[PDB]
Symmetry: C3
Amino acid sequence: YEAIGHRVEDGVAEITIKLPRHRNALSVKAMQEVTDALNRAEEDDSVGAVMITGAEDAFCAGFYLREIPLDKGVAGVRDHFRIAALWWQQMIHKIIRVKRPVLAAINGVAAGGGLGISLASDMAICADSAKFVCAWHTIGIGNDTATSYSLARIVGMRRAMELMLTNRTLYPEEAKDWGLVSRVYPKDEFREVAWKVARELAAAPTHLQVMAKERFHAGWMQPVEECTEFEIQNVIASVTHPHFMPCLTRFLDGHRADRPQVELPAGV
Amino acid sequence: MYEAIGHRVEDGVAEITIKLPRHRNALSVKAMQEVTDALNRAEEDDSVGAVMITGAEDAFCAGFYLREIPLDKGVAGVRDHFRIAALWWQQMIHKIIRVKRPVLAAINGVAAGGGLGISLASDMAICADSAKFVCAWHTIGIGNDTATSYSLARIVGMRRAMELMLTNRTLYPEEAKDWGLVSRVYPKDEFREVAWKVARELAAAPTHLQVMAKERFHAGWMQPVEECTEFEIQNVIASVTHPHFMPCLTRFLDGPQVELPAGV
Amino acid sequence: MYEAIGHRVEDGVAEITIKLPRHRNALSVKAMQEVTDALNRAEEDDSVGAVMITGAEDAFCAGFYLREIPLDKGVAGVRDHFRIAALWWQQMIHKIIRVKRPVLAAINGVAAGGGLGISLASDMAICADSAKFVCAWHTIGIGNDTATSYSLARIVGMRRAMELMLTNRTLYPEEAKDWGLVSRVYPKDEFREVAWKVARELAAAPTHLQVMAKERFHAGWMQPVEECTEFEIQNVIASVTHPHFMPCLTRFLDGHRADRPQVELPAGV
Ligand SMILES: [Ca+2]
Ligand SMILES: [Ca+2]
Ligand SMILES: [Ca+2]
């Protein structure tokens, strides 16, 4: 890849937003590469989870404003946004639809599209040095990157509306209180903690994960009876899968099902 | 009488006790059949104003009764049992959500898998300080169910729903309360009585009004504002037409419904 | 003009004041029509940037105006009345949610039944430490309405929505804030002023952008991500096309940075 950092180890496909000089804003090319990378992860039997993080001390500053053409008129501007907006779309959608759990490791500021990415991921943790901001209004653009889908689904309509309208910066503590992030860790221990959490996610049963993830997205909008129908189909498939019997055996042999799949350290 | 569950009717409350204490109150097929019947019966009963679901002893419900799974019939034997069992979990969960009575979940201890499902499907939930919640699905190796794909996010939001399930983390009362999973937490020793009082109060409150609110809440989550108001309006109209209305008004003109103690 | 509500347009804010303080600011049929009218007018006024709904005195709104219900005409009379007033509660509530302007609910005191509905239908909500919230329906013997089956769970989650309704408990500011029912709480004596500045800040902010966000938030709650992004993109494209865009971009590149949020909500208590 030439615009993103990418590495697969320990069952984790790690995608790094890398444009640190410009606060990890996402270029059109980079977005194409993240999506490709998400496609490849889903196709890799050796990948159990995906982790998205930023290079250095920023997560992602959102739209790459420095690539917008300024010498071609409104047209040039409209044209650029049609293309970049399509890639923000492709990528955000892939994060939500990919058949792998995605951990957003928020190591610094997440603005605009950056916040969009954080909201689209399955799990999210951040460094105590991280921060979140809508930023759309500041730059005079209508909000996107599925913020009309994700934000309210996580924080409720009221907080979603306030954050977008006030445009204020949300800090770790509050982000955690809001459900935006599950846990916060000292900056210095952040990377290590996050990689370990990703390895666990990767080691846990992908099949079950995917069933949970797809159902969560779909179920939000379905009535109970349709929900159960789809869940039951998953149940039947899961107990037919070779993974099951051995777990039952263990349970019957005294091993408790409250054993965690992923251990999230307390953090701060 | 029932053979796999505890069941009492007192002070307008139909108390359903999940009773398989030696096995942590896991729900057997038979039991689920009984629970559902009990729910139907309560709704058919003019004397019943509310339903209470609770577990026997110190456990709420450990979920799927795994000791009921046949091991001498191969994979198909397993599969066939789940089809039946899952159908029953389904009939029960749906009923809790659709029954025309308020349903109080009195979480007296551990709620795992289907036990958590029950907790989430209920109208109101309170737990003892000794209770805890765990998905279990991802460790026991079974795809999630018991409408967790419906109720969990509606309660705690998508992020927390996904986290809980994925990590298989155990949620203790203080966080469960902060999350909204339970409304109040009470000391283990005072628990049953607090719960009984709350239930008696719900039973006493106007059933028709409760049903209207219950049904609307479920439906409205998914409807546009204009459709929600048409349904609410129909409810208002019917309500001011009901005998209960006038007396309330005059009393108002002339000069809480359920008291949830603060707990811990 | 208006004879049943307080109203003004100043500093870009259309301020609607619920005014029936002897009666705790309950809403009469006539005031409801006026509130709806004023919302319509705000939306058509180039001079208005935001709307603020507040109560006169020490109450926000006690809901349905009970003293309007005909006791002399039996059942059909009572019902006929409810038919009309419910319609107006409805037209009003709908408008708050659909109006093309950000609406701030400045809850200066008690919000009961329909008053609670108004506060839930608004886009932003802040309250005085002296305020309180209560469903009240279950007590007066009426089915819940005013879009509570829409707004409440969207805000506080389904469990807390259910709870509040069923217990008919009174929610105080600290808890309402914890729940997300209100964003901030301010000392009673400071309230009016804080709220008025928040409204002015909301009005000064770019309405076009505000509207886009508001419409997508309501719509998107019920739509799949692919459908959400398509509508979002339509707004992105219209927004960078609009004259306001370029100046913001240039400034960013130039090194200009905002000294504060578009809308500042002071910490409060
Ligand atoms: Ca995995
Ligand atoms: Ca009742
Ligand atoms: Ca404005």
